[PDB]
Design a binder for these strands. Structure first.
Lengths: 219, 50, 50, 147
RNA sequence: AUAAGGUGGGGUUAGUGA
C-alpha cells in the first residue's frame, strides 16, 4: 500500500483555505473524508471569550447611559469575537474607549501573546460626547460548546456561553489522481472554513493526532 | 390591614430542551425530539449543514 | 403587633444571609436559585405593648 | 472523662441536633381551625425548640454516625435524650421494664431478675458519659476541619 | 417539613379519514 502526503495548502483567503491529500486507494478518500470532516467539526482547541465585567453595570438586563445598544446585544457581539493566544491558557483583556463613534476591535489593550484577528468587528456605538466603557474580558482556552449554566461570584461578573470552535464549515472532495503510470489513485481536496484563529496544517495534524490516539485504545 | 408590600421581579433565561412545542405557519405542529450534534446532520456537496 | 422586614432571623445559616442587604432585601442582580430567601420577614409573636 | 466547658459546648450542639432531627418526625396532629385559633392568642409554653442550620446538623449527623455506628443501644439512648428530650430517669423506667431477666450474676448471688431501677440509672449514665467523651475530640476537630 | 386553597367567570391544550 501507499501513504498520502501533504502536497499543497492553498491559502485562498484570510479566513479559509484548501489543502490537498494525495495519493489514496479506493474508499480511503471517502473514509478519511467523512472521518476528518467529523473530527474537524468535532473538537479543536478554542480561544473563546469566557466572561465580561463591564464597569457601571449591575447585570445584563439593564442599560448604560451613553451607548445606543443594550448590554445584551453587546455581549452577544462579543460571543462572536475571535482572538489568538499563544503563551497562556487564560488571559484577561481590557478596553477603554470614550468619544463619539463606533467601538471597534482595535480599542482593546493588546499584548504580545494575545492577538485579535478581525480588527473591524464592531461592538457598539458611543453616542455621547463624554461617556465611556471600561470592561475586562476574561478569555481562556477550551474545546467544544459549553453553556454558562453547566459550570461549577461578585455580581459585576457577567457570564457568556462558550463556543470553543475555531472551525466553521468543512467540505471534502475526492477525485482521481494524475499519478505516473497508474490509475485508481485519488486526489483528496478538503475545504475548511476558519474564522482566522487556526492554521490548517496544524489543524489536520491535531486531528490525525487525536485519531491515532483513538485507534491506539485497543491496538 | 397591610403595612407594606414588596414586589420582586425575577428574570429567567430559557433556551430550548427536547420536549418543547415549536411549529411553522401551516398547521405543521411539532414537539422537538432530539438535539443532535452537527456532525450527524445531512449536508450538501458544498458542505453546509441543514 | 406588626411584622418586620429586616435581616434579623432566627436559625438559618449565613448562606442566605450573604445575599441580602442591611435591610433584609436581595441586591439588584444577585443571581439566586430555588429555595433562597428574597426578603426576611418575621413576626413578633409575643410582643407586649403594655 | 470530659470537662465542664466541653460538656456545655457539646451539650448545646447536641440539643440543637436532636432538636433538628426531631423536626424530621414522621407526623404530628393539629387541625384546620387551631392555627386561626393560635395566631391571635399568646400560647404560653413555646414548645419550639431551636435548631441549627442544615449544614451543621447534617455535619454532626455524619459525626455521630461516624463514631456511634458501632453501638445501636447507645445511639438509641442518645436519640432518646436529645431527640425526644426525655429524661434519664424516664428511660430508666422504659428500659427497666424490658431490660430482660438475662440472668446477670451479681455480688449478692445467682439471681433471676432485672437489675434494679436503682441499678439501671448508673447503667445509663456510664454510657453517655463515655459516649460524649468518645465523640468530643472528633467533633471539635470537625468544626475546625470545615474551618 | 410553616405555602397554602373553597366558589364563580374567562382563556388555552390534547383528542378520524370513508
Amino acid at each position: 500500500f501507499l501513504k498520502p502526503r501533504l502536497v499543497d495548502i492553498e491559502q485562498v483567503s484570510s479566513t479559509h483555505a484548501k489543502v490537498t491529500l494525495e495519493p489514496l486507494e479506493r474508499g480511503f478518500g471517502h473514509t478519511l473524508g467523512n472521518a476528518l470532516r467529523r473530527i474537524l467539526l468535532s473538537s479543536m482547541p478554542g480561544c473563546a471569550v469566557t466572561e465580561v465585567e463591564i464597569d457601571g453595570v449591575l447585570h445584563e438586563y439593564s442599560t448604560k447611559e451613553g451607548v445606543q445598544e443594550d448590554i445584551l446585544e453587546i455581549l452577544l457581539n462579543l460571543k462572536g469575537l475571535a482572538v489568538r493566544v499563544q503563551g497562556k491558557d487564560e488571559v484577561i483583556l481590557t478596553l477603554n474607549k470614550s468619544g463619539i463613534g463606533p467601538v471597534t476591535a482595535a480599542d482593546i489593550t493588546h499584548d504580545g501573546d494575545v492577538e485579535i484577528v478581525k480588527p473591524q468587528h464592531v461592538i457598539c456605538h458611543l453616542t455621547d460626547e463624554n461617556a465611556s466603557i471600561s470592561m475586562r474580558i476574561k478569555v481562556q482556552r477550551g474545546r467544544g460548546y459549553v453553556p454558562a449554566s453547566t459550570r461549577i461570584r461578585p455580581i459585576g461578573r457577567l457570564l457568556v456561553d462558550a463556543c470553543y470552535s475555531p472551525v466553521e464549515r468543512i467540505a471534502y472532495n475526492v477525485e482521481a489522481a494524475r499519478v505516473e503510470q497508474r490509475t485508481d489513485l485519488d486526489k483528496l481536496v478538503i475545504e475548511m472554513e476558519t474564522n482566522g484563529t487556526i492554521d490548517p496544517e496544524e489543524a489536520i495534524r491535531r486531528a490525525a493526532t487525536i485519531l491515532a490516539e483513538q485507534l491506539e485504545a485497543f491496538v | 390591614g397591610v403595612l407594606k408590600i414588596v414586589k420582586v421581579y425575577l428574570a429567567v433565561k430559557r433556551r430550548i430542551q427536547p420536549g418543547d412545542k415549536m411549529a411553522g405557519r401551516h398547521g405543521n405542529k411539532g414537539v422537538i425530539s432530539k438535539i443532535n450534534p452537527i456532525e450527524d446532520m445531512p449536508y450538501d456537496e458544498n458542505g453546509t449543514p441543514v | 403587633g406588626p411584622e418586620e422586614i429586616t435581616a434579623d432571623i432566627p436559625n438559618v445559616g449565613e448562606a442566605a444571609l450573604s445575599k441580602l442587604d442591611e435591610s433584609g432585601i436581595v441586591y439588584i442582580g444577585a443571581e439566586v436559585t430555588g429555595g433562597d430567601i428574597l426578603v426576611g420577614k418575621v413576626t413578633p409573636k409575643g410582643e407586649t405593648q403594655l | 472523662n470530659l470537662t465542664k466547658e466541653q460538656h456545655e459546648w457539646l451539650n448545646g450542639w447536641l440539643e440543637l441536633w436532636g432538636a433538628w432531627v426531631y423536626s424530621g418526625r414522621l407526623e404530628k396532629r393539629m387541625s384546620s381551625v387551631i392555627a386561626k385559633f393560635m395566631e391571635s392568642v399568646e400560647p404560653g409554653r413555646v414548645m419550639t425548640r431551636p435548631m441549627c442550620n442544615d449544614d451543621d446538623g447534617m455535619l454532626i449527623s455524619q459525626v455521630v454516625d461516624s463514631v456511634m455506628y458501632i453501638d445501636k443501644k447507645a445511639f438509641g439512648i442518645l436519640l432518646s435524650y436529645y431527640a425526644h428530650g426525655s429524661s434519664k430517669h424516664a428511660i430508666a423506667s422504659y428500659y427497666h421494664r424490658v431490660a430482660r431477666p438475662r440472668k446477670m450474676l451479681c455480688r449478692g448471688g445467682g439471681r433471676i431478675q432485672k437489675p434494679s431501677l436503682a441499678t439501671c440509672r448508673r447503667e445509663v449514665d456510664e454510657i453517655l458519659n463515655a459516649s460524649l467523651f468518645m465523640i468530643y475530640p472528633v467533633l471539635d476537630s470537625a468544626f475546625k476541619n470545615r474551618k
